[PDB]
Design a protein around this ligand. Structure first.
Ligand SMILES: O=[N+]([O-])c1ccc(O)c(O)c1
Ligand SMILES: O=[N+]([O-])c1ccc(O)c(O)c1
Ligand SMILES: [Zn+2]
Ligand SMILES: [Zn+2]
Ligand SMILES: [Zn+2]
Ligand SMILES: [Zn+2]
Lengths: 360, 360
């Protein structure tokens, strides 16, 4: 059975289980079951499923080199699909809540969930909470008797926590750290001293690399009972490296990819985000360029946004991206080589992950 | 050591552990650690700790009748305190998010967290997510080697899920179920046909009784390794009965308790909530009273709110409350008697819980 079709079949199965359990154990009525079904479909479906399918692909790699009964192969692949959906539902939680937090308008060419006429923020915040709860409900049901249950739940909650910490790093990245204070309304930085590579790297590491790359890779190992087959420190290093590249590409697209292609209007400049573009620009700018950036960044005024995009264009940041890209290619190939010492199979799965990311 | 002082000492310990771990494993800086410390204190402290202290009191009851080394007594009580704080932090999550969802202004005489000048909704939604994550971080750290870890985490996530489902039941309780639809803006009911005792009971059961009574009672049993000492179906029944009474009292106070005493301005009438008052009023009203209720309920207009409160006053609902109260006293005393068959000690702990609730 083709992997994507298996993955989609398991979505339907998990959805039916969750809604049936709501009827049999939580007294739900058919109309609220329908609302939650539509909520699940709208918030969890329609992406590329890169994260969930990484779990499946990692598990497929180990099946090709490991002796198993056919029923065991089917169990492992089903487990990989359920685990992949746990990650997709975790992402769905964060996208629902982040879109509310950020006042976002569209996602993937459609309105953000909270903007649906019959949803509203009052419902959508709680819908996002339900999405997160569903990750645990499906784990306890499908993995109840599994040897990896404890490790998988512990990993999942650490990654969830890392992601929330990273969200804090992101939403505070345009303020001066020493002025953070719940009692005092937060001004945007004026010196941009905290727009540095190391501070940028911390935001990205926590807000997206743990749930986008580390969690799918390690979940694939766990459902395969293969974690002792790899050097975990290398798994972490390569997950954080590929994940940073993924976010850098996202940052570039926010500014330069046409909205029809991007699926939304990017507002990182108006929002004063600590983006790869801003950090790289400030790392190469002269005094006059820095002053012009300061006079225009973080402002809704379209003329000021246009000034910032021209500064980026004139600074030839596409060439800095090519140099960054070349160094990532070099470092990821090195880590893949090291992963071969203990597992050529897992190294190949990571090579596939990188190629997909690189060619996005 | 007095129970409350132990409980507060464990708060300080858990807080220090969480913040130290953020520094050593999540790359946090001192200013963001300070923000999160203040967030934790502001959102988790200042209530009565009824829920957390129930865990401790249940465990204390079993210690009095069970043979243990002194070090084991100390371990059990420390575990009970950590488990109690898990429940308090879970509540804190829901109060932060519910206050945002509902546009609430005050809680306990102070501004809701999202309204702090240096917080804002953008940060507060994520702060609430962190509060929930902390419940799991503290469980995995303190209970890693404990025999009850699996049962405790499974129970906790079921109760968390029930609570979110109950929040859905609550925030949709003024709409007609058959018209729920993410695509269509939701009108308030005009017939109030779903303002019934059974529908009210479902809201309350899920939105507050699981986390306010069932979870603290069962967590106390789990940390005491005493769950086989009780009839779990009776624990559930008595938790749901006491928890309903607790919410009925809250509903009455929303309407009739002065804001200075209540800690907020109650708006259940303007919000068109399915409250015990509205359900009881509609269960005894004549046609003219029903029509007057319909013409005034769910409206911000203070004159219309005043009409509704007068309808309630003239309907002598205080007497319906006394009758409801008398039946609850009768039913709770019956369940306590049944709990004595297997555990007089646990029955007494439940009797204490009821007395505290009744005399609130
Ligand atoms: O962007 N990609 O290609 C991705 C993103 C996340 C992944 O886990 C992955 O394996 C590929
Ligand atoms: O209101 N009370 O007194 C309460 C509320 C919750 C509890 O778990 C409790 O033991 C007492
Ligand atoms: Zn965001
Ligand atoms: Zn972006
Ligand atoms: Zn509410
Ligand atoms: Zn209330």
């Amino acid at each position: 059975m083709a992997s994507m079709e298996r993955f989609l079949s398991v979505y339907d199965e998990v959805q039916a289980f969750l809604l049936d359990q709501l009827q049999s154990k939580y007294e739900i009525d058919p109309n609220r079951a329908r609302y939650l079904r539509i909520m699940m479909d709208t918030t969890c479906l329609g992406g590329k499923y890169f994260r969930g399918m990484t779990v499946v692909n990692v598990a497929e790699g180990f099946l090709a080199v490991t002796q198993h009964d056919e029923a065991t192969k089917e169990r492992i692949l089903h487990d990989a699909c359920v685990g992949g959906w746990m990650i997709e539902f975790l992402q769905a939680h964060y996208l629902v809540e982040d879109d509310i937090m950020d006042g976002s308008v569209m996602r993937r060419g459609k309105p953000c969930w909270y903007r649906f006429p019959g949803v509203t923020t009052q419902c959508a915040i709680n819908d996002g909470i339900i999405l997160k709860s569903w990750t645990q409900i499906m784990a306890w049901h499908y993995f109840a008797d599994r040897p990896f249950l404890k490790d998988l739940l512990c990993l999942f909650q650490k990654v969830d926590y890392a992601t929330a910490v990273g969200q804090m790093y992101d939403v505070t990245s345009m303020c001066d750290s020493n002025k953070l204070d719940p009692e005092v309304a937060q001004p945007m930085t004026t010196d941009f001293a905290e727009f540095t590579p190391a501070i940028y790297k911390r935001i990205v590491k926590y807000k997206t690399t743990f749930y986008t790359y580390l969690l799918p890779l390690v979940m694939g190992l766990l459902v395969s009972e293969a974690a002792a087959s790899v050097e975990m420190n290398l798994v972490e290093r390569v997950a954080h490296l590929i994940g940073e590249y993924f976010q850098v590409q996202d940052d570039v697209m926010d500014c330069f990819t046409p909205p029809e292609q991007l699926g939304k209007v990017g507002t990182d400049i108006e929002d004063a985000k600590c983006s790869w573009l801003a950090v790289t620009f400030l790392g190469k700018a002269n005094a006059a360029q820095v002053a012009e950036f300061k006079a225009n960044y973080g402002e809704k005024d379209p003329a000021k946004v246009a000034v910032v995009k021209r500064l980026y264009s004139k600074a030839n940041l596409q060439a800095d991206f090519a140099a960054y890209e070349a160094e990532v290619v070099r470092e990821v190939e090195s880590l893949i080589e090291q992963l071969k010492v203990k597992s050529p199979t897992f190294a190949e799965s990571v090579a596939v992950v990188w190629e997909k990311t690189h060619k996005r």
